[PDB]
Design a binder for these strands. Structure first.
Lengths: 49, 50, 187, 539
RNA sequence: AAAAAAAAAAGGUAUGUAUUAA
RNA sequence: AUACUUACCUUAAGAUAUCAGAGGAAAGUCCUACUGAUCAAACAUGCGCUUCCAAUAGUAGAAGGACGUUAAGCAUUUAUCAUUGAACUAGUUCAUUGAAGUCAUUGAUGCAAACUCCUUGGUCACACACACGGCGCGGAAGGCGUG
């Protein structure tokens, strides 16, 4: 139903940026939007590459 | 008190201040679910009529 | 129910001299050697903050300095007290600038009023400036985020400080000041 | 149902995706939260647990991103309290008080207010107030806190001893409202009808000694007690003199200048005068030498501006020198790494604190952490201070790890296969990266045979062969390549000056001369006045 | 021889509106 | 307080000590500031009736408390359940997922003392008086008795 996402852990290339269970710092987002969410950050990653 | 949901204004309502909360004491009696009078009453026996 | 239990305190004003002026910046540095130049005194009072300098009198063996912010001034007064310059223990306190000094000295002969005029304020809000900070040298489009120092002063031009370039500039002038200082060009 | 009706709404997807795209805004967090609350508006126990789990995880995930928000720890506590579990309310009050290091006035006041209703066992309840007192008690606005605590004694306590005990302490504190408590003290002096009740103020001996009044006095008591109330009110008037003086100073100078006592957000800016008054207020507080009020006034000053690194550095300095506590300073700088945005000064001073503390595995670990932040390229960073502070402390470590390779026992600091490749990768970028000459100047510092040969061939020679224009037009390059040969202890004077003139100089192109001459003259003017002419004839 | 019609509102509390002085 | 408008609503029943005798309107009822007995209340009033009512010839003491301190006193006993994976004896540790979860562990239970402070009393009169266990004036609380 909902996925928990850590844009810090994602942009830092670390593994655990998402999980199904609730963890301290993650933001709940809609699961279908997860893919969409990745799009929103890609340019940031594109700036680092 | 803050809200005082009442007919009285603020000064009268703050005048009715209750005593502080009652301290907790562990129950010395039998819980309500366990409460019963004596069961297994021995009926009037043929040995009693004896 | 006429009089009340509590009142706000009312209090008298202390005549507004240069010692009770909360906006005063310029620090009178007395007890100099008069063997010292002004560019050497700047070397002493530079790190405490950005300076808008006034003057060092000739033959009077006492100078004075002026900063932009009072925090830098107080940091200089507490920082250097009794610190010898050319083997003379320096005694420094608060004092006015050159023009107000003139307005005082014309009154000292005629002993009339000596009405002080306090320094101008900075019209304070300012969200971009962090007091007691220096721009060590001179295109900048920044993020204007809180941590960085946005605005600053130049040794009279307000400049936007680039946090990345400021450290490498300051270290560049630092390593130049050693090589020129050892051989006698800078003092 | 209401939950699924909230998911399929477009506003939840948009607000959510905004939050996850822009974490530190706190504007999108508060809209996401205010919206998901209003969708749930009958928030009582009836509403289904999925929605409560989402809204709860939303609070708890917001408070982690912004560890200073007092009204949100309070608000989430009240949500848990209306929902019917007080244990979760307690726990997350404890969480908020822990985020502030146990000193915040609002969380203690709004906490104990909650604690009066839900906690019996008078003793423990008062232990909460004694814990709050030794932390936030001396706060300048803490009087209303005391107003709670005194209010809780007079209702709970039959003895009245403790009310005199506490109110006597409140008399000596320079609060914002001292006079409110002086009126209670004076009134309670006025209501004393017997000599026996003067022992409540102070013991029997100090009254007979200092003020020379006797409780056991036997005779016509009335006028004697009226004299005793005057003699007791005089000294209270004196205490009022001192404490009034302190309060009026603290207000007239500092507290009157402070317009913002709260956190706002990471995107807030504070005015310069407010910064200056926090700095001077902290210096004054340090001067008072009251440790509780000192740490309080740092944490009090810390929430208005947490993101600068300004008060973090000072609050590490006063604790590293005045108190002489080095671990506490390390811990201050570590907690400062989280809130502060700039982080460079804090991490430099932090490198130093860790060096002096003699923890090398922690420092080297932290260097591994900061090089892992950039994906093992620190050399490509835009901001030079991070690469430089990283590179020199990294050097200080690999000097200790690997034994020196070079004669004369000189450690190889900046010349190593690991670090020299880092330096050379930093230099290959030329105009695009900032540091440049600063990194180059420190390659001249070796002062020996082996290392002047090494740095001669492996950089200053290769940089000529590849022939980059930025480094050749530069005068700092040629000046340093002269100073590298000139300070060698192996060479005599003749081969030194002859080597600089016959080789180093003619390698300069005459079109670069206009830029190269000013900096390279400064080397020749001071050190070689004799050969100054053959310099001028070349250009 | 017999005869024929009935007498009546009560009064309590609360809310809103108006009046009772230079 | 008066006038008008609107709303909310209306009578559980019976009785006022008992018993007995005489009278008035064979059975029953009602009645008699009628006669006796017993009971009850109020008011008086008494008892060699009973118990209690604090030091000043001294810095005390009696009753009752502290929702007071010593006091983190001393001595004890306690800190969640389920699922999956790894190691392990043939139960144990670590990590992950779910459920509820008064606070306290300076707690809670038991044991004991010291100290400090609060409320209360006739702090009355006569007496400092070698007896075989009274017969001063009052107040408080009772019991018994007469009117």
């Amino acid at each position: 139903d909902i996925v928990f996402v850590s844009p810090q852990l994602y942009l830092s290339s670390q593994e655990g940026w998402k999980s199904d269970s609730a963890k301290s710092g993650f933001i709940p987002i809609l699961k279908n939007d997860l893919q969409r969410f990745q799009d929103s950050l890609k340019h940031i990653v594109d700036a680092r590459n | 008190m803050n809200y005082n949901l009442s007919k009285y204004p603020d000064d009268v309502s703050r005048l009715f201040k209750p005593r502080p909360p009652l301290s907790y004491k562990r129950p010395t009696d039998y819980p309500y679910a366990k409460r019963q009078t004596n069961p297994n009453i021995t009926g009037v026996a043929n040995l009693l009529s004896t | 129910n006429h009089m009340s239990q509590f009142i706000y305190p009312v209090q008298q004003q202390p005549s507004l001299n240069h010692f009770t002026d909360p906006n005063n910046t310029t620090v009178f540095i007395g007890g100099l050697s008069s063997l010292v130049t002004e560019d050497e005194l700047r070397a002493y009072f530079q790190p405490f903050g950005t300076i808008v300098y006034v003057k060092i009198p000739v033959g009077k063996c006492c100078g004075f300095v002026q900063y932009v912010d009072r925090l830098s001034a107080e940091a200089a007064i507490a920082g250097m007290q009794g610190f010898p310059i050319a083997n003379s223990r320096v005694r420094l306190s608060w004092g006015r600038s050159a023009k107000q000094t003139a307005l005082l000295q014309q009154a000292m002969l005629s002993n009339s009023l000596q009405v002080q005029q306090q320094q101008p304020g900075l019209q304070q809000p300012n969200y971009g400036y962090i007091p007691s900070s220096t721009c060590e040298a001179p295109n900048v489009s920044s993020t204007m985020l809180p941590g960085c120092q946005i605005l600053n002063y130049s040794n009279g031009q307000q400049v936007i400080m680039q946090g990345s370039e400021a450290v490498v500039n300051s270290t560049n002038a630092m390593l130049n000041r050693l090589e020129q200082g050892s051989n006698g060009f800078m003092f | 149902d209401k939950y699924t009706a909230l998911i399929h709404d477009e506003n939840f997807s948009t607000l959510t995706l905004n939050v996850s795209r822009y974490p530190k805004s706190l504007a999108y967090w508060e809209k996401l939260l205010n919206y998901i609350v209003k969708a749930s508006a009958p928030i009582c126990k009836s509403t289904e647990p999925q929605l409560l789990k989402l809204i709860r995880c939303t609070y708890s995930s917001m408070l982690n991103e912004f560890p200073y928000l007092e009204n949100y720890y309070i608000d989430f506590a009240l949500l848990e309290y209306k929902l019917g579990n007080v244990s979760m309310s307690h726990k997350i009050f404890q969480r908020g008080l822990q985020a502030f290091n146990q000193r915040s006035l609002l969380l203690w006041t709004s906490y104990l207010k909650f604690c009066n209703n839900v906690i019996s066992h008078q003793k423990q309840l008062f232990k909460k107030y004694e814990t709050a007192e030794e932390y936030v008690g001396l706060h300048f606005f803490s009087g209303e806190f005391w107003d709670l605590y005194l209010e809780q004694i007079s209702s709970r306590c039959t003895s009245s001893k403790k009310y005199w005990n506490v109110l006597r302490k409140i008399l000596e504190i320079p609060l914002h409202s001292f006079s409110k408590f002086y009126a209670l003290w004076l009134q309670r002096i006025d209501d004393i009808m017997d000599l026996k009740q003067l022992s409540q103020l102070t013991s029997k001996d100090e009254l007979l000694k200092k003020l020379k009044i006797d409780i056991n006095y036997s005779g016509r008591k009335g006028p004697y007690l009226q004299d005793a109330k005057k003699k007791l009110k005089k000294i209270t008037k004196e205490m009022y003199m001192v404490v009034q003086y302190q309060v009026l100073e603290i207000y007239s100078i500092f507290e009157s200048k402070i317009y913002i006592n709260y956190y706002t957000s990471p995107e807030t800016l504070v005015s310069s005068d407010e910064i200056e008054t926090w700095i001077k207020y902290l210096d004054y507080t340090i001067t008072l030498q009251t440790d509780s009020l000192t740490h309080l006034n740092f944490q009090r000053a810390l929430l208005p501006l947490a993101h600068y690194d300004l008060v973090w550095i000072k609050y590490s300095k006063w604790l590293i020198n005045s108190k002489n506590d080095l671990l506490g300073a390390k811990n201050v700088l570590l907690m400062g790494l989280k809130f502060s945005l700039k982080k460079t000064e804090i991490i430099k001073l932090l490198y130093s604190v860790i060096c002096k503390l003699n923890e090398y595995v922690l420092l080297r670990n932290l260097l591994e952490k900061i090089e892992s932040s950039y994906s093992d390229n620190v050399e490509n960073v835009d901001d030079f201070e991070i690469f430089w502070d990283y590179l020199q402390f990294k050097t200080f470590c690999q000097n200790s790890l690997y034994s020196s390779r070079y004669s004369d026992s000189q450690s190889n600091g900046l010349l190593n296969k690991e670090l020299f490749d880092k330096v050379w990768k930093r230099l290959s970028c030329k105009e695009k990266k900032s540091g440049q000459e600063i990194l180059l100047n420190n390659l001249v510092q070796f002062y020996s045979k082996d290392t002047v040969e090494f740095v001669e061939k492996n950089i200053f020679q290769k940089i000529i062969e590849f022939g980059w224009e930025y480094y050749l037009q530069n005068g700092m390059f040629w000046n340093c390549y002269c100073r590298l040969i000139y300070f060698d202890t192996s060479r005599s004077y003749l081969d030194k000056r002859q080597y600089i003139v016959r080789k180093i100089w003619p390698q300069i192109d005459k079109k670069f001369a206009q830029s190269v001459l000013p900096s390279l003259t400064e080397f020749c003017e001071s050190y070689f006045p004799e050969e100054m002419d053959t310099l001028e004839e070349m250009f």
